[PDB]
Swiss-Prot record:
Transmembrane segments: none annotated. It catalyses: firefly D-luciferin + ATP + O2 = firefly oxyluciferin + hnu + AMP + CO2 + diphosphate. InterPro entries: AMP-bd_C, AMP-bd_C_sf, AMP-binding_CS, AMP-dep_synth/lig_dom. Signal peptide: none annotated. GO terms for cellular component: peroxisome. Keywords: ATP-binding, Luminescence, Magnesium, Metal-binding, Monooxygenase, Nucleotide-binding, Oxidoreductase, Peroxisome, Photoprotein. This is Luciferin 4-monooxygenase. The lineage of its organism: Eukaryota, Metazoa, Ecdysozoa, Arthropoda, Hexapoda. Coiled coil: none annotated.
Amino acid sequence: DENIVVGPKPFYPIEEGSAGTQLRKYMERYAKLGAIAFTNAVTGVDYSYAEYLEKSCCLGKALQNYGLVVDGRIALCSENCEEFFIPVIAGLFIGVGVAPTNEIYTLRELVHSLGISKPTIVFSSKKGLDKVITVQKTVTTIKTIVILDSKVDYRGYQCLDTFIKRNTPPGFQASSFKTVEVDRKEQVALIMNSSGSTGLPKGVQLTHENIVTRFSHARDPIYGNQVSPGTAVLTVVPFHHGFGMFTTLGYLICGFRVVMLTKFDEETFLKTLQDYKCTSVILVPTLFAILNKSELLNKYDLSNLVEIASGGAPLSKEVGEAVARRFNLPGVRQGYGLTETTSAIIITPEGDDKPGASGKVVPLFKAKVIDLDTKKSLGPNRRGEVCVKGPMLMKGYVNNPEATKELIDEEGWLHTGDIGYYDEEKHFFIVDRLKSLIKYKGYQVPPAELESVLLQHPSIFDAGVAGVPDPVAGELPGAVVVLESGKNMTEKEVMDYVASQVSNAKRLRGGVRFVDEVPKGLTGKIDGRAIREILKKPV
Ligand SMILES: Nc1ncnc2c1ncn2[C@@H]1O[C@H](COP(=O)(O)O)[C@@H](O)[C@H]1O
Ligand SMILES: O=C1CSC(c2nc3ccc(O)cc3s2)=N1
C-alpha cells in the first residue's frame, strides 16, 4: 500500500540495555564533565548531573532494601520541581514501574489514577501531600508517603533524603550500584495518564522498549537535538505527562541543562531565556500569545535562542509564523504524539519546515490516514483519521482490555482519534480531535480552525470553541473568549470579525461568551464539555 508513510532509519540505532542502563551511561558521562542537569528558573537552584545520578542510584538501592521487587510500583504526585525525575530514574534503574501524577489533579482524578496504578510508595510534593493523604484513605494499599521537595522531614513524613538514609547502609557507595536488566519489550517502565480525557484517567503502560526508542529520536540529528556540552533548554511543560516526561528524559540523554520554568509572566519568561542563555524552548500553544504580543523582546538578550518548539495541542499556523518571524527563525519546530505512543511520532525534521505542518513520521514508525467510514487508507491531501504503528506503541491500558482493543486494531494500528492529512511530500498536518468536530448540518467544523482565527485578533488573549445543541442544525459553533486587558469586544464584534474570515458553515451561530479563563487541560487541549456548559448559561 503506497498510502502508508514509512519513517527513515534512525541515525543512531537503538542501544542495547534497558532505559535505566542508557540513562546511567549518559548521565555518568555528563557527571564527569561537571555539567548541570536541572535548574529551577525562578530560584536559580541547580542539580549537577553528578548529584542527580548519585541520588537516583541511592534511591534505587533504598527501594530494593525497602523490599520492592521487579515489576513493583511507585508513584509521584507533584507539580513540576527539580527533584521530579529522581524517583523516575531510580525506578527505571531497578525495574520498578513509576506512575507520575500532578498535584493539580482533582481528588476524583487522583483517587481513580492511583487506584489503577496501585503504588506502594508515593513521592509527594509538600503541596500535593494533603491530596495524597486523602487518596490513601481509599487506596489503602499505599504504604508510605515520602516528601519529594523538602530537605527535612515534613509534617511527620520522611523527606527523600531521609528515606534514602533510613534504607541504605552507612557509607553505601552509589558508584557500586548496578542497573537491573529487564525484558525490554514487556517490562513496564511507566504508567502514564493522558490529559484532557472526557472520562476518568486510564493507566497507559509504557515499556523500556518504548523509552529506548524515544532515546534514539531525542539524539537524532534530524528528528531530535544533537549532543552539545551544557547547552540550556527552557521547558514549561508538565513533567508528569508524556510531553514533559519524554522531552525531559531525552534532554538528559543529550546532556542538556534543563531549565524548568513554572511561572509564565512575560518578564520572568524572557529574563529566564536571557539569564540561562537558552538555545531551545519547548512550549504549549498558549504561551505563543505572550511572545507574539510582547513589547519587551527588545529589552532582553535573546540571541542564544535558535529553536522554538510546540506540542500538545493545535498551534495556529499564523501565530506560530509570527513568533518565528519575531525571533528570525525559519519556523516553529513541532511534535505530535499521544500518551499511548510514548512521545511524538510526527516531528518537524531539521531543515525540512513546511508552513503549517506538524512534521514527518519519525524513524521506525509508519503512519496512514483512513477514511472515517470505510477505514481504508487515503492518498495525500485527503482528510481522515491518523493511524500509527511502531515500537513506541504502549503495551496497553492497565486492567482495561476493552479500551486497548478499541484503540489498537486487529492489524496492530493505533487509531489516534485525530483528523489530519499528509501532503505530496509526506508532511503531516494535524487538524483537531475527531470527537471535537462540530456537526453543523452536514459539515464537520474543527474548533481549532475557529480558535486560530480568534487568536489572531489583537484584542483577544485566548479562546476556545465548541458546539451548542440546535434542533435544526444539530450543533452550532460557539466560542468562549478571554479579552486582552483594557480591550473590549461585544459578542456581535467577535461574530462579525469571524464571519469576515471564514466560510458560512464556520460562523459562530452558537454565540460568544466572555470569561477570565478558557477551560483547557494540562497540555493545552480545549475542554469542550466545559465550554458547552458556559455557552448554555443565560448571560
Ligand atoms: N502537535 C499537536 N498538534 C495538534 N494536536 C496535538 C499535538 N500534539 C498532541 N496533540 C493532541 O493531544 C492528544 C494526545 O493527548 P494526551 O492523551 O494527553 O497524550 C492527541 O491525540 C492530539 O489530539
Ligand atoms: O499529547 C502528547 C503526548 S507526548 C506529546 C508530545 N511529545 C513531544 C515531543 C517533542 C515535541 O516537539 C512535541 C511533543 S508533543 N504530546
